[PDB]
Amino acid sequence: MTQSPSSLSASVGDRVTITCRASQSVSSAVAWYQQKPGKAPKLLIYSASSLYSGVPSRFSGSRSGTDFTLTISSLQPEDFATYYCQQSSYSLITFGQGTKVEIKRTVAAPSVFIFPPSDEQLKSGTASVVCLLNNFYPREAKVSWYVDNALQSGNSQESVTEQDSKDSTYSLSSTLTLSKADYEKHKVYACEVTQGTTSVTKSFNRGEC
Amino acid sequence: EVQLVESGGGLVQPGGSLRLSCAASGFNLRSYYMHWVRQAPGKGLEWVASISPYYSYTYYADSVKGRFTISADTSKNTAYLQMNSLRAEDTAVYYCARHGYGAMDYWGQGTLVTVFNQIKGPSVFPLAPSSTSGGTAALGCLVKDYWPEPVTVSWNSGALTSGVHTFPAVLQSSGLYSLSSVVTVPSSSLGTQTYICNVNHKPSNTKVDKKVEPK
Ligand SMILES: [Cl-]
Ligand SMILES: [Cl-]
Numbered sequence: 001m002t003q004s005p006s007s008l009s010a011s012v013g014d015r016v017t018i019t020c021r022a023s024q025s026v027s028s029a030v031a032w033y034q035q036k037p038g039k040a041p042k043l044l045i046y047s048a049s050s051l052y053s054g055v056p057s058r059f060s061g062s063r064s065g066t067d068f069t070l071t072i073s074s075l076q077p078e079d080f081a082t083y084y085c086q087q088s089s090y091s092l093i094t095f096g097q098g099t100k101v102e103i104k105r106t107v108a109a110p111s112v113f114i115f116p117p118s119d120e121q122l123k124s125g126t127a128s129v130v131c132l133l134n135n136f137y138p139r140e141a142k143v144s145w146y147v148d149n150a151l152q153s154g155n156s157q158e159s160v161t162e163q164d165s166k167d168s169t170y171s172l173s174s175t176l177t178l179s180k181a182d183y184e185k186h187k188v189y190a191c192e193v194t195q196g197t198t199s200v201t202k203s204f205n206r207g208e209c
Numbered sequence: 210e211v212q213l214v215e216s217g218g219g220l221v222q223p224g225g226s227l228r229l230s231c232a233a234s235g236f237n238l239r240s241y242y243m244h245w246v247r248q249a250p251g252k253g254l255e256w257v258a259s260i261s262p263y264y265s266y267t268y269y270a271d272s273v274k275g276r277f278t279i280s281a282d283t284s285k286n287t288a289y290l291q292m293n294s295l296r297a298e299d300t301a302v303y304y305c306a307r308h309g310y311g312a313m314d315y316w317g318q319g320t321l322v323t324v325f326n327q328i329k330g331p332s333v334f335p336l337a338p339s340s341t342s343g344g345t346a347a348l349g350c351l352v353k354d355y356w357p358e359p360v361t362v363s364w365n366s367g368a369l370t371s372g373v374h375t376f377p378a379v380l381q382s383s384g385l386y387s388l389s390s391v392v393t394v395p396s397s398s399l400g401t402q403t404y405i406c407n408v409n410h411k412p413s414n415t416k417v418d419k420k421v422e423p424k
Contacts, residue, residue: 031312033254040304040316041254047311084254088311091268093244093256 020085110136127183131191218320231305242308330415331355349391350406
């Protein structure tokens with residue numbers, strides 16, 4: 001199954017189209033897989049156009065006679081991978097030769113999440129508030145903690161993981177450690193993440209789901 | 210949650226055999242099609258084999274037919290790939306996978322199979338004679354760390370054949386071969402006669418001559 005192109009270099013935000021010409025008959029609908037380096041393939045599309053559960057809506061598949069296409073409508077940095085098409089018959093499975101999608105490095109903003117302490121942990125006398133910055137680049141981002149709008153200092157620690165690839169991103173956790181007393185006597189908890197000219201603050205109110 | 214967990218990979222010799230396992234959990238593979246798919250280093254996915262539910266019909270890629278056997282044990286909820294007569298082209302990460310939605314929805318983590326393929330010429334070390342053995346001394350050559358088989362050994366370019374014992378090679382844990390060749394000679398000859406073992410390793414286009422002297 002010739003795939004086209006065999007490799008391509010693109011930028012974040014680009015629309016990417018990968019073609020797969022059928023080696024088996026066309027009634028044997030195609031499936032598409034994504035394989036990150038050093039990892040098992042992941043199913044994206046089955047029956048030419050059906051999105052497998054959990055796969056993002058930016059992936060879509062279609063057919064035109066003997067021609068099956070995978071489209072990534074808006075490339076994300078986590079889409080760096082080799083993509084494979086496949087037809088299945090009762091006696092024979094065939095893969096396309098693969099299309100390596102390389103993505104130019106650029107700034108990636110973090111997805112920010114804030115987590116209140118659990119009721120279970122408050123029984124220990126301590127409250128941990130956790131802020132997650134997921135999949136960002138480059139390394140430099142500033143975390144500032146606020147409690148009823150008072151900037152905190154000296155009571156948070158950070159930790160960083162890197163994906164260890166070519167288009168690898170960072171993720172970062174910041175943990176604010178408070179006594180149960182302090183946690184219970186204040187209401188608004190906010191994690192502000194500053195990268196470049198953007199700051200994003202995620203917050204919660206104690207006791208308000 | 211559904212999971213496939215593989216085991217069994219490693220380093221093996223050409224012509225050798227290996228068995229890979231694919232342990233299913235969260236489902237019974239009795240009612241599913243299971244497959245093996247492989248990926249040679251830096252290359253694309255290649256289907257290897259499949260086995261069908263209930264009747265255990267099997268299908269193989271042409272490259273592995275007659276050498277690989279796929280099977281499944283429903284009581285152990287495990288599928289297997291028996292790999293015989295291995296070739297250099299079989300080096301790959303091997304994946305097992307379950308057939309789901311006209312496709313392969315769950316995949317194992319992969320296990321690496323490496324078929325030894327590195328040609329290496331031998332190192333030849335002397336087995337030196339003392340003397341403490343009465344009137345007859347032993348000496349020889351240790352032929353270490355070559356691949357693949359074979360090497361041939363003569364002594365004094367073939368002029369010395371009486372008393373020679375060249376042992377079968379042994380496969381070392383490294384995957385490389387080693388052997389020794391020894392000869393018994395009169396102790397009186399040690400001061401005067403030269404003894405040289407000639408080791409030919411055609412696969413690496415290497416010949417080694419080693420003069421063996423008393424230490
Ligand atoms: Cl760091
Ligand atoms: Cl309150």
